[PDB]
Amino acid sequence: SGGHPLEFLRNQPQFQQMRQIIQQNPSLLPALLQQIGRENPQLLQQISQHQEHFIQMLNEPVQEAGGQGGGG
Ligand SMILES: [Ag+]
């Protein structure tokens, strides 16, 4: 529920999904956003306001690489 503090969203598995794939596919930013908007149209609109923070933290290295991979 942290609108400006994206770091609180970062800890959500839904965001982990985006972060892991971003590290392999940064061009998938507008694509992953659609996955957010699908389940969370409200959260999406808030992310649209705070995209800068979103993309920056999406790009940082994450612990869980992701079992589904995403990249390739
Ligand atoms: Ag800020």
Swiss-Prot record:
Cellular compartments annotated = Nucleus; Cytoplasm
STI1 domain boundaries? 4-47
Coiled-coil boundaries: none
Provide the assembly information.
Answer: Component of the XPC complex composed of XPC, RAD23B and CETN2. Interacts with NGLY1 and PSMC1. Interacts with ATXN3. Interacts with PSMD4 and PSMC5. Interacts with AMFR. Interacts with VCP; the interaction is indirect and mediated by NGLY1.
Family of the protein in this entry:
Belongs to the RAD23 family.
Question: What is stated about domains?
Answer: The ubiquitin-like domain mediates interaction with ATXN3.
Q: What does the function comment of this entry state? A: Multiubiquitin chain receptor involved in modulation of proteasomal degradation. Binds to polyubiquitin chains. Proposed to be capable to bind simultaneously to the 26S proteasome and to polyubiquitinated substrates and to deliver ubiquitinated proteins to the proteasome. May play a role in endoplasmic reticulum-associated degradation (ERAD) of misfolded glycoproteins by association with PNGase and delivering deglycosylated proteins to the proteasome.
What is the protein's given name?
UV excision repair protein RAD23 homolog B
Q: Which organism is it from?
A: Homo sapiens
High-level lineage: Eukaryota, Metazoa, Chordata, Craniata, Vertebrata
